[PDB]
């Protein structure tokens, strides 16, 4: 049998890399590849995606996002068309947690953890530096709601809830009241998670209230470090980063490897049916689709460039690698590593906010 897979990349060098990867894969039943470029608007993107589907009846679609604004404007139409035809779609560089709800996007996978999955590193950091009190500060949105829900579910084991959760509206010009209220409850460790363009206002406001002095400890995610959020930021802010969140060659190699292994494994079964080959003519489903997703979910890869690869029943990768870095004198520097296990510290002494080198107690 001859089965081919399709992808929607962002350039031509990525297309050449995909062709080389599939050429190396088929040299280890022949498979080909098909590629297309992104479009400014969603509707033409979706119709072109289903036209590409009808062209060769692609078993799976490898989608990716470019370094472009609007965030979730590029990967939505492909997911909607796939959900119309119930064919698997594998994402590469989509970090948002809206797609993690397995009710509206039944056919979707991720090669990178979502933005809301960086809630365990904070737990381990508190368990290592002996901090038991936090002040959660989030924006009123789906991302913040999911992050706070996951954090409280994780923290419910110790039967010690967060001291307070402060939700602020997404997009404003004065957040002075919330910070003034949260300044003096009882706690020092502040955990922030919001949009960078909204976190800049919080950073500017916190400087006027003298809350960035000695003693207080800050913690952030990844959106508060990149972008323009470095204009206003107190030194000593501890942040997290993904080790291989930008180099897409390794991601495409791992994705093509796992897809090839899955397509090799499925064909050994029986009672299969080819997916529909028309975006226009056919108005039916691809019944032997969920079985492919189920056999792909447990596709425990042996080894690769990005380490071991696995999956959960949520369309998210496990066993991620995180780097814990500190901002010293407007210059980032890595200070620790986290490999799913306990956090391993490096040979560098961090600088806590306000100067001085001594682990703050965090409680008054």
């Amino acid at each position: 049998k001859i089965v081919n897979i399709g992808a929607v990349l962002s350039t031509r060098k990525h297309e050449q890399m995909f062709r080389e990867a599939v050429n190396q894969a088929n040299k280890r039943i022949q498979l080909q590849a098909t590629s297309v470029t992104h479009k400014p608007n969603a509707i033409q993107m979706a119709l072109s995606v289903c036209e590409d589907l009808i062209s060769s009846q692609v078993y799976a679609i490898l989608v990716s996002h470019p370094p472009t604004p609007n965030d979730h404007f590029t990967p939505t139409p492909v997911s909607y068309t796939a959900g119309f035809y119930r064919i698997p779609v594998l994402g590469l560089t989509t970090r948002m947690s809206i797609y993690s709800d397995k009710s509206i996007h039944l056919s979707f996978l991720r090669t990178v953890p979502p933005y809301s999955h960086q809630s365990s590193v904070w737990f381990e950091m508190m368990r290592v530096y002996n901090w038991n009190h936090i002040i959660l500060l989030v924006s009123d949105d789906h991302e913040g709601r999911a992050a706070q829900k996951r954090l409280e579910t994780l923290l419910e084991e110790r039967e010690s809830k967060a001291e307070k959760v402060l939700q602020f509206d997404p997009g404003t010009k004065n957040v002075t009241a919330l910070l003034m209220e949260a300044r003096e409850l009882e706690a020092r460790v502040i955990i922030l998670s919001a949009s960078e363009d909204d976190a800049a206002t919080v950073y500017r406001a916190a400087a006027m209230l003298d809350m960035t002095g000695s003693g207080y400890v800050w913690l952030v995610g990844e959106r508060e470090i990149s972008g323009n959020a470095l204009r206003y930021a107190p030194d000593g802010i501890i942040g997290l980063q993904l080790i291989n969140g930008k180099n897409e060659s390794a991601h495409i190699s791992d994705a093509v490897g796992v897809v090839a292994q899955a397509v090799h494994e499925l064909l050994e079964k029986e009672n299969i049916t080819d997916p529909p080959r028309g975006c226009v003519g056919n108005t039916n489903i691809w019944k032997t689709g969920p079985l492919f997703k189920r056999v792909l979910m447990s596709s425990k890869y042996a080894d690769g460039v990005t380490g071991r690869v696995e999956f959960n029943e949520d369309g998210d990768r496990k066993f991620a690698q995180y780097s814990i870095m500190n901002l010293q004198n407007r210059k980032l520097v890595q200070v620790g590593i986290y490999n799913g296990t306990h956090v391993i510290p490096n040979d560098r002494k961090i600088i806590w906010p306000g100067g001085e080198t001594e682990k703050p107690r965090g409680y008054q």
Partner: antibody, heavy 115, light 108 residues
Framework: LQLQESGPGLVKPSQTLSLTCTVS?????????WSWVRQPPGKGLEWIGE???????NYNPSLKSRVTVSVDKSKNQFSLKLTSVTAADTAVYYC?????????????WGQGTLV | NFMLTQPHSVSESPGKTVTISCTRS????????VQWYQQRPGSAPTTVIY?????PSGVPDRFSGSIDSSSNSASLTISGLKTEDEADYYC?????????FGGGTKLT
């Protein structure tokens, strides 16, 4: 607070550099940073690296594995230990202090040392 | 790292206003603003412009700073030129990696 350049002031090639700053009127144990900006003759400027008072010293990617900066509070001075300097690195070296604040601000500078 | 470009050989009669534009080579000056230092022949450089809007205590009010965000450059304006303005002016910036100094200009 006032600082002046010091050191042995050698010009021989294929050796190691060693020179220390002065800083009188200030305290090494503080919340500032000390830089070692280097000025080549007849050209622009080039930053070398800063050093915090207690434990950690930043650097520059180019000469990252060829230079070393040390401090000593007992003698109230910090010194530069450039290694494997060739004959193409002739320049006049400055001693610079920067205020932490929120940004970099290399002021006040030093008198400068010929090299 | 990146590079900085500055105009060269700019001078005129006293009493005029001159704008010197220090331009980013690659990227955008929007997350890390620049500063302007001045140097006297035979003397150590001294800062005159910091955060492009503020001035150090005792500095003359003739000099001023401005931003454009269009050509990715910072402008330093000198009004009422005097015989003591002949010096070397350097623009200095930084990023998330390091600190790099500009080429600099001379004013006669």
């Amino acid at each position: 607070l006032q600082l002046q350049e010091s050191g042995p002031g050698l010009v021989k090639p294929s050796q190691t550099l060693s020179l220390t700053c002065t800083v009188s009127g200030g305290s090494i144990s503080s919340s500032n940073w000390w830089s070692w900006v280097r000025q080549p003759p007849g050209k622009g400027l080039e930053w070398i690296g800063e050093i915090y008072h207690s434990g950690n010293t930043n650097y520059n990617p180019s000469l990252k594995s060829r230079v070393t900066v040390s401090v000593d509070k007992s003698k109230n001075q910090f010194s530069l230990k450039l290694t494997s300097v060739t004959a193409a690195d002739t320049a006049v070296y400055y001693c610079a202090r920067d205020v932490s604040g929120g940004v970099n601000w290399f002021d006040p500078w030093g008198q400068g040392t010929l090299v | 790292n990146f590079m900085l470009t500055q105009p060269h050989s700019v001078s005129e009669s006293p009493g005029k206003t001159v704008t010197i534009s220090c331009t980013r080579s690659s990227g955008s000056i929007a997350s890390n603003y620049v500063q302007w230092y001045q140097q006297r022949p035979g003397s150590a450089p001294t800062t005159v412009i910091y955060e492009d809007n503020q001035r150090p205590s005792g500095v003359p009010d003739r000099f001023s700073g401005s931003i454009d965000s269009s050509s990715n450059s910072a402008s330093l304006t000198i009004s009422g030129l005097k015989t003591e303005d002949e010096a070397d002016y350097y623009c200095q910036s930084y990023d998330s990696s390091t600190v790099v100094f500009g080429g600099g200009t001379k004013l006669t």
